[PDB]
Design a protein around this ligand. Sequence first.
Ligand SMILES: [Ca+2]
Length: 118
Amino acid sequence: VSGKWYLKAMTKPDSVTPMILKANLEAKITMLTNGQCQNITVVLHKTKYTRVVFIQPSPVRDHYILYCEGIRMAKLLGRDPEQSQEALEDFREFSRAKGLNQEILELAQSETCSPGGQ
Ligand SMILES: [Ca+2]
């Protein structure tokens, strides 16, 4: 669960850069949001982690599913960028199976974020 990862879907972002999980666990995405850039860097510490976040394996080759409470959403991380309909279908069930049913948004993959006119 280390290295380049791709946040593929989620139950706001207009595009998203790759994810970098360093091992407490430490993630860095940068997120394109209405012509801005949100550079995130969230340490996850082991208590299910900490917001509160449960990482769980996906049933599918090369994918993981995140549940986090703190509003509650769900995310589908992948190890290679391409769309996996069968990874989605499972992320949907999981998402309804945990109380979340507000549009599986499948994310746009940019290699950089440049702010509007910045
Ligand atoms: Ca938008």
